[PDB]
Amino acid sequence: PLPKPTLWAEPGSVISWGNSVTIWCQGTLEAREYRLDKEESPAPWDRQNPLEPKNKARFSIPSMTEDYAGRYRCYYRSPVGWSQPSDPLELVMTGAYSKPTLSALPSPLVTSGKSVTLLCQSRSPMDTFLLCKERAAHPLLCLRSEHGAQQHQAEFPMSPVTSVHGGTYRCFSSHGFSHYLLSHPSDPLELIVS
Numbered sequence: 001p002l003p004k005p006t007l008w009a010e011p012g013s014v015i016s017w018g019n020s021v022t023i024w025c026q027g028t029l030e031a032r033e034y035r036l037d038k039e040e041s042p043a044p045w046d047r048q049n050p051l052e053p054k055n056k057a058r059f060s061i062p063s064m065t066e067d068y069a070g071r072y073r074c075y076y077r078s079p080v081g082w083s084q085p086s087d088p089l090e091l092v093m094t095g096a097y098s099k100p101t102l103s104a105l106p107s108p109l110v111t112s113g114k115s116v117t118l119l120c121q122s123r124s125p126m127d128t129f130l131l132c133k134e135r136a137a138h139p140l141l142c143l144r145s146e147h148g149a150q151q152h153q154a155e156f157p158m159s160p161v162t163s164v165h166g167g168t169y170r171c172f173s174s175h176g177f178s179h180y181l182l183s184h185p186s187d188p189l190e191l192i193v194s
């Protein structure tokens with residue numbers, strides 16, 4: 001088997017509508033041709049006669065839209081044949097829906113040891129809500145509230161609240177059936193612990 005190439009995105013896998021992202025696939029110097037499949041799209045989604053140095057291929061997305069969110073796999077051909085496919089790359093878009101609101105009950109000012117509930121609310125019916133703290137770069141990996149029935153809010157109970165929980169939070173809403181399409185992030189909520 002010809003070993004799979006490596007795939008990544010710059011700046012990364014979470015891109016706001018209208019912003020730029022580049023998908024990079026790196027095989028070897030023996031690569032004669034790179035191809036990218038997008039999940040659920042006709043194959044191949046794109047292709048490149050590498051050059052480049054034939055070491056890597058660049059797939060540019062100048063202006064992100066919902067048509068680009070989802071997963072991608074890269075495979076390449078050398079004189080020997082076709083490679084195994086790369087691990088899939090998830091490309092998440094924010095801005096598919098209006099921003100939700102994020103608030104703290106009873107207050108974002110919390111006494112250490114007590115509890116608080118963060119409330120994320122959406123105008124559009126949503127079944128998935130994600131609560132992310134500062135420095136969380138991958139919203140899909142954040143605390144998640146999933147529901148069968150559509151909702152207009154999700155609660156994130158936090159207990160106990162201590163110094164470590166202090167910081168800035170944002171929430172996102174989505175539908176689980178299109179989980180790579182997120183709302184705009186909510187305005188930031190600063191949790192202040194005393």
